Every structure is written in C-alpha cells, then in structure tokens.
C-alpha cells in the first residue's frame, strides 16, 4: 500500500506495523525447517518469534457480516484506534500466555483475551 | 522458500566457528615452536618497559 | 553431418552380409538430429517438440534397426552399434534421449560426479543395463557376474550410511567394505 | 515456474532425508547399547539406603519430620542437538515450577541444552552447570553426586528431574527427592537396629551418604542416556517422514512445471513458424 | 515382618551378577579391622569393604562364577528382613589377576595430608592383592 | 586406612578405592580399566565465563579433598 | 533473475543493486542485497577518505552474513565470534 | 583440459592434480553432514580432509596485476615447477599444521608459510 509512511499516517501506526510485517516474516523464514522438524529443537528466540507469530497470524482473522451464513457467527467491525492498539499490545506480549484458538476470528484483542481467560477457567 | 540456501550457511557458519579456533592453536603450538639497538639498551638501563612504538619515535627523531 | 552415419552403416552391412563381424561407432550422434532439423527449419517444415521434425523419431530408427545379428544361411555375420548422445542436464526426459534409449535395447549412463570422485570409467551401474544380459557373456562370466551384480546392488542400498561406518552396528560396515573392494 | 530452483531445492530436501535417514540408524544403534548398560546396572543399589532406614524403627520415632523450605534443583538433560524433545520437556517443567516461585531453587543445570536453554529465562540463579559427558560410569557419577553434594549444604532439600526410559518408544519424565548431607547426617546418627562397628559410626554415615547420593544419580543418568537415545530415533524417523512427504510434493509441481515449460516453449516456435 | 531363610544380592555398576540367590550358604569377607563372616540368620549390620576378596561356597555350582573375587570396594548392609546385599564398584576373578603388572606409570604421588593416605592404601591394597593370588 | 583418610583428610570413600585401583589399574583385565574413567566438563555459567574440564579425578579434581 | 529480459539489461550495464523482498520487511531499508551487488569501478571512483574505511566494511559484513546461521544453532558462542556476530549487527 | 593427460604430461603432473580433485570432491559431500551435525562429529579422517581440502581451496586464490585496482595487493607470478611443488606438499601435509588462513591469495607454498610466522611474531 502506497498509503503506508511514516510521514502520511502516525509514526505509532508505522512502527506497529513493520512490527508484525517483521514477526511473520522472521517466522516465514523459518517455516521450511519447522516442516521437515518441530520447533522443540529451534532456539529460544527463533520459538518466541514463532510462538507470537502464531498469535498474530490468528487474530487477524475475523467473521464478517456477510459471510455470518458460512461460518454462523456474527460479524465485526474493528476501529482504527482499536485495532492499532489491538496489535500493540499483542506485538508486547500480552496474550502470550493465552492459547492461540482464543484469537481464532475475533473481533479486538480484548475479546480474545475474555474467550482465552476462559478456556483457562474451565480447566 | 529456500533450504538450499540454509544448509549451504549452516556449512559455512559451522566450519568458520570450527576451524577458527584450530587456527588459534596452530599459531600457538607453531609460535611455541619457533621460540625454540642504541634506544633499546639506554632505556633498559632505567628499566622502563618500552613500547615498539616509542623506539620508532625517537630513533625518527634522531634521523629527522 | 546427416548422411555420414548412414554411409558409415553401410559400410558395416558389408562385412556383416558376408558373414564376418564389423563394429560401428556413430560418435556424436545426437549432433547428427541436430543437422536433419537445421534442415528441416530451413525447408520450413512443420517443427515439433523441441523444434525437432515429426520423423525424428524415424530418423534413427531405420538407422540403427540396419545393425543386427544375420542367421547362419546369410554368413552368420553381424553388425554392433554403439551410438553416443550428449545430455545436457544429465535429464533423459528430453526428447532426443527418450527416442533413442526406446529404440536401442540398453544405455550405459555415465555420471560426472563419479568421475570427479575418481571412479574412472565413470559407468553407473544403477542406470546401465543390458537386455541380452547373461545370454551373451561366457559360461565364465555369467556365474560370477550374477554374484557381483547382487553385491554392488545391496552397497548401493547401504551407500547412504557409508559416511556412518563406525557408528552403525556390525555385519553391515564389513559389507559397505566390501563393496568399496569392488 | 523455474525448473532449475525447484529441481536444486528437491535435491536439498533428498540429502536431508538422507542424512535424516542414516541419523537414525544411528540412534537405534546407540539405543541398544545404552539399554544394553541399563539393564545391566538399573535398580543398583536403590532404594537399599532407604530401606534399611525404614527398617530402622527407633530412626523413625527420632526421624526430623519437617517440610524443607529451600531446595536444590538439578535437571538433566542430553548436551548433543537434535536428539528429540525430551530435553524440551524437562526444560519446559523446571521453567514452571521454577517460574512460579524464585528465589527458592538453584537450579544447577545438567546438559548443555538444559542449561543453555534455562539460561536466558533464570539468569544469576543457575551459577554452574556439568555438560560434555565423555560417558556414563559409577566413578563419574560420583564425582557428580559429589558436586551435588557440595552444592546441597545450601539448601534444604534436593531433586533430580530426568527422562524415564519404560519403553523404547515411551519416555516419561520422572523426579527423585533426595535429603542434603546436613539432614542425612543428623537422621543417620540415630541408626541403632542395624549395626556399625567395622568401620565406626563417624565414618559409615558418611560413607553410606555417598552410595545414597550416588546411586540415584547414576540411575538418572541411564534413564536419560537411554530415552535420549530413543526420542532421537524417534524424531529422525518423524524427520525423515516428513522430509519425504515435502520431497513427493514437489516432484508433481516439477513435472507440472515440466509440462508448462514444454508448453512454452513450443507455441513460441509455432509462433515463429506460422509467419 | 521377617522374610525366608536368606537372600543374597550381588551387583555391579556395569553388570549384576546375582539378583537374588538362595544356594549360598556362607560369605567372608574382609573389613578394615578384620574378617567378617555373613551367613543365615546373621543380625543387622553396615559394613564397608575396602577393596579386598570376596569368598562365597555355593551349594549348586552357578555358571560363570568361580565364588571367589577381588572386589575395589563395596558397600555391604544386612537388612532387618535377613538379607545381605553386597555391592561392589567392579568385581572381577583370580585368574584374570595379571599379576606383576603394577606401578606402570602411576607410582607419582603428591606430597600433601591427602597424597599421604592415598599412597598409603595404595600400597596397602598391592600386598593385599599379591597375598590374595596365592 | 579407609577411616583416617576420610577423618584426618578429607577423602571419600570413592576417591579411595580410585586411588586404590590406581596401582593396580594396569593388573585389572581391560573390561575394568574403561570403567574406571572420569572425564566431564564444569561450566560456570554465564555466555562464556568459565569452562572447566575434570580429567583427573584422584586429586582435588572430582572428589576434592581437605588435604588438598 | 534468471528471464530473458533481466539476464540481457545485467550483462550491459556495469553493476546492479538486487534488491530483496525479505529484507525489506525484516526492517532492513533500503533493502540492498550486498552478496550479489559489485561495481566494476569499484573503489576507482570512491574518496581516499571512503576506500580505506569501505573495505574493511565489506570484510566485516562478509563474516556476519556466514555467521548468521550459528546463530540459529546456538548452544554455545566464543569470545570472538559473539563480537564479530554484534560488530556486524551494527553495520 | 585435453592435455590432462598422465601420457602428455609428466606423470607427477598428472597425480597431483587428480589428487585435488579427489580431495574437493569428497570435502563437497561432507558438507551436506557437516551441516547438521557439524565439523566435530565428524571421524578424524573426515576433518583431516576438510581440513586439507579448504587449505587447498583458498589456496587456489591468486591475486593478479589487473585485480589491484580491487583488491590493492600487487600481482605475483607462479611457476609450473613450483605450482607443482607447492600442491604436491599440501597434500603430503606440508601445511597442515599453519593455519588455513595464510593459504589464501598466495603465490608459493614458501609465501604462505613466511606469512604465517611473521603473524605469530606479530601477537
Ligand atoms: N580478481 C578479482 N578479485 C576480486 N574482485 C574482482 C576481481 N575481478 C573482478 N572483480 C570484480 O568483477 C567485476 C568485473 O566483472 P567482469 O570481469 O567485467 O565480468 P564480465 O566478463 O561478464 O564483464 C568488478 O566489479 C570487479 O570489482
């Protein structure tokens, strides 16, 4: 996108993003050896960097309002303040601990947080 | 996608870190092996340890 | 460059009609499909695959189909050919390859890899094969060629773990030895 | 879509599973010697300190019966890479129970994975660490009981977290509690059923110290070298799977990429011959 | 509460000779102050064993074993349920004794409070060894 | 002495019978001679501080000792 | 690069600057692939101030690029190397 | 080269030149092992012939009088005498023992070796 500058839109908004472009481009870098092997035996940074990356690559999923007949969830719709922020504390690491289905098609960080703080309650 | 170019760095960066550290016992083991003036004695005499760097100032400064 | 390994055979056919034996050696030949398409081209022939003409494939078959054993009542004589083809990324899926090895009966494949190793001639066992096989060595032969082809045949299958010879348990490092004697 | 990168990437796949493959045999190789030794030298000497102790009656009445507040953790893991994900697990529970509260372990690692893996998370907990095992015998495992020992009088209590070799194929991870000197001492002092008279008391407890600290060691050690053996195996043949599944795919969009390059290649001469 | 007439178990680091053995019917050995002898009914008692011989009689020949060993060291406990385990950092036979073939590099000591009693039961343990082939 | 040289000296029960089998390492068959081997290394742990190789194992190596 | 078009423009013009849509999201801009960049001049044209300190400045690179794989490996890291590793981090 | 001949060219020639090729050939398929396993896994005679085999390599390098301008060492000039000298010795082990990093860009076996004694008196 053209539109992505640091100069055009916010300098926070431009760094958030070339944080998660960085993520999953480390992560992509590396998914040929995790397919040959698991990440047990990758090292401690390269696992955070995959561990996190499969976070973000599952939030960004979310239903839509046409498409609520195929999946049979309702729609969302995400702000712009809050989906910056929504990454930003992602990107920090606050959602580490929760397992990733939490962020599986979810509308903004918190509600994954509420569905991932719950499937630690239940068990 | 290319694993060619990860075995081929894995080789490199490996064979560098191994043999780097022969390379300082060759010189060791090889230096050990080889083991087995006017500026040089008036500084001796006053028993200061002298730098190769200073010798060459002032045998410069005497020819200069 | 095209009528040269016609001109050779004939030559050949001579001794073989008169009952003696004649070995023909048709060097370059993939060279030679080369100069029939340049002339094809230039004729404006319909090309092909590879820009070669339909009847390249014809091209050698009535060629080398001219070489073969006669019976007893012409002389008994006979005519070996031994065409040579050049690939170029070692890859017999091309399609001057594929002509030639379904005409011939068997290849004898050479690697460049087992020639830098230092394994002169640099014959591929794996790939060469010979059709008449057995049927036309001697009784000599036939016995202790049946043997070594079985044992070269297991070295290559464990050549995989030669680099681990130590490591690996005993009764298989003695006979990754073994095929290194042979 | 470029033949030549996808047929030299085929080729890189094909040597790892090839190396994947011998790999293997190597560790089914070294698995059947290490259980070979551990069947040889299992149940040595185990549990004999800690039976006669329970045997001793009047030591029970005596027996200090307190809950230690400050323990000595010592994890076991394999120093060479890629030998599967039992070092994974041990790391993964000492980083739990160790995470949860600080301050309270010291955590004095065993393998170079072990250590090099909980060095970034407990950073000035873990001082020093044994890795570069040449082999595993009872003088050696000594000499680390010994360590261990050393290193104890500082806490209250000390673990040892290792892999369970029950199976070829079956690796759980399984933790011994052993008392420090300090504690063995004081409990050993009031053994009276069994008696000590050959070598006197002062010596025997010190002495029968080192055979209680040993033997769970050197039986640590052979559970661990063995499963070690075991998830190496079983992850080169998972490697060498999954190598030849990816290698199998590529070959279709090889010939794929074939059939397409033929076809390009073979307008682009029609082209030119129609004019 | 009590156990049958006896067991013996007999192990080694790198190998275990006897897990449970019945046949026995006596075992002598020698302590720091002086030989012991275990056999049935024998009481409750540790015992350290430096490294000496280690005779056993066997009612029923057992194969592979000659009943008579030298032993580098052992531990040795007769639990209250009447049984006696001896365990031994390596065990080995007289015959393959080698005899003459000590101090081949190793005489060097270091003059200190410990070098001390380590050339001293070094040398104790070779007038033992060479009294046990006879 | 097993007794004294644990009292007066700080020397285990262990480091005893290795200094014993010392002068006998040679006598032994070969089957004893690879068991009694002790070769590790000591790492005090941080990126690269130390690293520590115990080889000997009779003096104050693997089992130190008080009168070391 | 291996097309027509491309292979033809390289083998007429002096040098050419590759450039890598990885390293560009990795945070590295302007994303430059110095392994397979050249100049024919090469330090003919550059200022006695910039030949001295540019070819050091390759030699390091040239190292950390090799080393970058150990990193992955890990498990251990000698004095010099960790150096030579954050020297080139720097460059 | 057609004249790669043990019948043109003298006999000694002709050996010590297959005696390379062998030796890089076979360095070239270790790398594939070396690359997960590493050059310490290796068997002793494996590393002696990386080893040789890289010293040979770098040794290969020589810089000429039109590569100044690049590299700023003056050019040097190599007999056919002592070229064969030079490579019959390295694969004796003549040079095994110097490090593999004064056999690069040299002219002569006797240039590498005088390179490496003069680092050792340097440090
Ligand atoms: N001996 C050399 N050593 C190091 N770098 C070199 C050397 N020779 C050339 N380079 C580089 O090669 C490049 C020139 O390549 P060139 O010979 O012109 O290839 P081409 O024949 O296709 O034109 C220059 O940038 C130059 O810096």
Request: proline letters at 0%; glycine letters at 18%; hydrophobic letters at 40%.
């Given at each position: 996108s053209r539109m992505l500058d640091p100069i055009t839109i916010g300098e926070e908004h431009y760094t958030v993003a070339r944080g998660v472009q960085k993520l999953l481009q480390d992560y992509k870098s590396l998914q040929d050896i995790i397919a040959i092997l698991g990440v047990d035996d990758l090292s401690e940074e390269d696992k955070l960097v995959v561990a996190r990356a499969r976070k973000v690559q599952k939030f960004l999923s979310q239903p839509f309002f046409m498409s609520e007949v195929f999946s049979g969830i309702p729609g969302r719709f995400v702000n712009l303040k809050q989906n910056i922020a929504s990454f930003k504390a992602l990107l920090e690491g606050a959602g580490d601990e929760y397992p990733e289905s939490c962020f599986y098609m979810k509308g903004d960080l918190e509600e994954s947080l509420a569905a991932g703080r719950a499937d630690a309650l239940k068990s | 996608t290319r694993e060619e170019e990860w075995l081929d760095k894995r080789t490199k960066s490996q064979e560098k870190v191994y043999f780097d550290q022969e390379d300082r016992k060759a010189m060791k083991r090889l230096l050990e092996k080889l083991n087995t003036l006017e500026v040089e004695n008036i500084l001796k005499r006053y028993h200061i340890n002298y730098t190769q760097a200073l010798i060459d100032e002032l045998v410069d400064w005497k020819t200069g | 460059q095209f009528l040269a390994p016609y001109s050779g055979c004939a030559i050949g056919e001579f001794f073989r009609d008169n009952g003696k034996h004649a070995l023909i050696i048709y060097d370059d030949l993939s060279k030679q499909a080369v100069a029939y398409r340049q002339m094809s081209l230039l004729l404006r022939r319909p090309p092909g695959r590879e820009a070669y003409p339909g009847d390249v494939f014809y091209l050698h078959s009535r060629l080398l189909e001219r070489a073969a054993k006669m019976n007893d009542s012409l002389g008994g004589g006979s005519l070996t050919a031994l065409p040579v083809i050049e690939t170029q990324a070692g890859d017999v899926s091309a399609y001057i390859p594929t002509n030639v090895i379904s005409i011939t009966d068997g290849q004898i494949f050479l690697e460049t890899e087992l020639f830098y190793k230092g394994i002169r001639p640099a014959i591929n066992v794996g790939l060469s094969v010979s059709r008449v096989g057995s049927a036309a060595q001697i009784k000599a032969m036939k016995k202790i060629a049946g043997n070594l082809k079985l044992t070269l045949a297991t070295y290559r299958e464990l050549a995989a773990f030669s680099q681990f010879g130590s490591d690996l348990d005993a009764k298989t490092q003695q006979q990754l030895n073994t095929g290194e004697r042979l | 879509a470029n033949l030549k990168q996808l047929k030299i990437r085929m080729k890189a796949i094909g040597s790892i599973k090839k190396i994947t493959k011998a790999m293997k045999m190597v560790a089914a190789s070294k698995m059947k010697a290490e259980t070979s030794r551990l069947e040889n030298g299992?149940?040595?000497?185990?549990?004999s300190v800690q039976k006669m102790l329970e045997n001793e009656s009047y030591v029970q009445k005596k027996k200090s019966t307190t809950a230690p507040k400050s323990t000595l953790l010592v994890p076991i893991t394999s120093?060479?890479?890629?030998?599967?994900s039992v070092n994974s697990s041990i790391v993964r529970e000492v980083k739990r129970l160790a995470l949860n509260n600080?301050?309270?372990?010291?955590?004095?690692p065993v393998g170079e994975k072990g250590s090099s893996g909980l060095s970034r998370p407990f950073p000035d907990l873990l001082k020093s660490s044994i890795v570069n095992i040449q082999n595993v015998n009872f003088p050696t495992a000594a000499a680390i009981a010994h360590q261990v020992s050393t290193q104890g009088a500082g806490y209250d209590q000390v673990t040892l977290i290792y892999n369970h070799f029950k199976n070829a194929i079956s690796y759980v991870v399984k933790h011994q509690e052993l008392l420090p000197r300090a504690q063995f001492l004081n409990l050993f002092k009031?053994?009276?059923?069994?008696?000590?008279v050959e070598p006197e008391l002062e010596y025997s407890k010190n002495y029968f110290f080192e055979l209680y600290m040993a033997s769970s060691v050197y039986n640590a050690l052979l559970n661990s070298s063995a499963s070690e053996q075991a998830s190496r195996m079983n992850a080169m043949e998972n490697a060498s799977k999954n190598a030849g599944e990816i290698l199998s795919k590529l070959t279709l969009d090889y010939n794929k990429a074939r059939q397409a390059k033929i076809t390009m290649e073979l307008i682009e001469i029609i082209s030119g011959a129609s004019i | 509460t009590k156990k049958q007439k006896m067991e013996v178990t007999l192990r080694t680091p790198y190998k275990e000779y006897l897990a449970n053995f019945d046949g026995f019917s006596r075992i002598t050995a020698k302590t720091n102050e002086a030989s012991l002898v275990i056999q049935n009914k024998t009481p409750a008692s540790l015992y350290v064993l430096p490294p000496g011989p280690l005779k056993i009689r066997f009612t029923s020949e057992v194969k592979n074993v000659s009943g008579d060993f030298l032993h580098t060291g052992g531990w040795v406990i007769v639990h209250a349920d009447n049984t006696c385990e001896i365990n031994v950092m390596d065990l080995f036979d007289r015959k393959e004794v080698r005899a003459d073939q000590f101090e081949k590099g190793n005489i060097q000591d270091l003059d200190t409070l410990a070098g001390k009693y380590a050339a001293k039961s070094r040398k104790s343990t070779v007038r033992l060894f060479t009294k046990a082939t006879t | 002495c097993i007794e004294f040289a644990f009292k007066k000296?700080?020397?285990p029960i262990v480091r005893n019978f290795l200094h014993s089998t010392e002068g006998v390492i040679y006598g032994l068959p070969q089957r004893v001679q690879r068991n009694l081997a002790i070769n590790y290394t000591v790492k005090q742990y941080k990126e690269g501080k130390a690293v520590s190789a115990k080889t000997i194992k009779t003096l104050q190596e693997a089992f130190p000792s008080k009168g070391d």
């Open positions: - | - | - | 299992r149940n040595f000497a185990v549990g120093d060479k890479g890629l030998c599967g600080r301050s309270a372990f010291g955590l004095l009031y053994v009276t059923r069994h008696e000590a | - | 000296a700080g020397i």
